[PDB]
Amino acid sequence: HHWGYGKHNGPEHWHKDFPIAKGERQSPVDIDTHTAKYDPSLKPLSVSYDQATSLRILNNGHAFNVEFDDSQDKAVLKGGPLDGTYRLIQFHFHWGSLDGQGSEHTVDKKKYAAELHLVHWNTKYGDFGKAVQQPDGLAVLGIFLKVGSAKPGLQKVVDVLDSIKTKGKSADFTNFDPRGLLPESLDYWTYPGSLTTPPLLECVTWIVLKEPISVSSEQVLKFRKLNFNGEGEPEELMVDNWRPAQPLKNRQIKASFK
Numbered sequence: 001h002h003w004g005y006g007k008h009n010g011p012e013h014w015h016k017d018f019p020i021a022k023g024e025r026q027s028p029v030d031i032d033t034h035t036a037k038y039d040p041s042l043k044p045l046s047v048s049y050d051q052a053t054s055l056r057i058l059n060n061g062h063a064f065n066v067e068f069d070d071s072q073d074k075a076v077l078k079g080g081p082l083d084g085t086y087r088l089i090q091f092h093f094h095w096g097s098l099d100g101q102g103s104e105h106t107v108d109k110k111k112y113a114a115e116l117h118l119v120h121w122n123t124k125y126g127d128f129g130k131a132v133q134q135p136d137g138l139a140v141l142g143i144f145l146k147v148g149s150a151k152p153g154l155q156k157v158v159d160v161l162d163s164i165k166t167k168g169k170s171a172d173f174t175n176f177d178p179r180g181l182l183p184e185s186l187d188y189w190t191y192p193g194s195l196t197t198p199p200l201l202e203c204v205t206w207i208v209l210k211e212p213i214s215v216s217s218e219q220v221l222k223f224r225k226l227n228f229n230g231e232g233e234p235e236e237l238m239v240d241n242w243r244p245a246q247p248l249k250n251r252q253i254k255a256s257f258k
């Protein structure tokens with residue numbers, strides 16, 4: 001049938017409906033810290049979320065997205081390897097069924113517990129659907145999550161997961177401040193990639209932050225109680241909604257540090 005992360009519709013079957021899966025700039029990738037080139041021409045990352053306006057949280061059957069009001073230059077990301085401004089449209093996670101897997105990007109073949117992706121689109125393109133049609137249309141900020149101490153700013157996300165347990169369910173989720181999810185350092189690795197879930201459009205400029213954020217075992221656990229299925233259908237827990245690392249091919253991962 002249609003895509004997912006199960007044995008019969010998982011990552012290894014996506015190339016049949018979306019031939020771009022075997023593309024030239026696919027994400028995620030394994031970041032080799034010793035092969036990544038330090039580039040001093042890379043400017044600092046500029047995250048301006050002080051005027052962020054969260055609107056809703058939704059379970060789309062592949063994960064839960066927290067959507068923001070992107071009708072104005074409220075929550076933007078600029079600087080880094082980017083040219084111009086990018087509006088935060090939404091953020092989501094990708095976790096595992098166990099604490100030793102869940103991240104999509106790996107650092108030195110190392111996988112973390114999960115991975116937050118704050119999706120952004122280039123404003124010089126008007127809307128989101130026009131950005132996915134250009135090679136520099138999106139900038140996803142990747143933040144790894146490791147199990148350890150709780151993350152206060154992530155708790156308001158965790159408590160509303162009961163009301164979006166199944167596919168297609170939503171809930172009013174305003175006043176969330178994404179700044180409470182950012183690690184202390186903004187060091188990062190950037191590289192040209194794509195979406196990690198279908199359509200798998202090669203339109204992303206990936207900015208994977210070097211520093212991870214810790215979340216309690218209790219916080220990641222409550223992610224695993226969500227379901228892929230819609231209401232009234234046989235329960236399938238939402239776990240391992242991550243794509244395996246892809247070939248780097250004709251690409252170079254740059255770093256803003258040494």
Ligand SMILES: NS(=O)(=O)c1ccc(N2CCCC2=O)c([N+](=O)[O-])c1
Pocket residue numbers: 117119132138140194195196197198199
């Ligand atoms: N996992 S990622 O961040 O690569 C990612 C995965 C999927 C999507 N899309 C595309 C259509 C709806 C949606 O959620 C995006 N995206 O916003 O482009 C991002």
Ligand SMILES: [Hg+2]
Pocket residue numbers: 131132133134135136137201202203
């Ligand atoms: Hg594109």
Ligand SMILES: [Zn+2]
Pocket residue numbers: 092093094117196
């Ligand atoms: Zn993602």
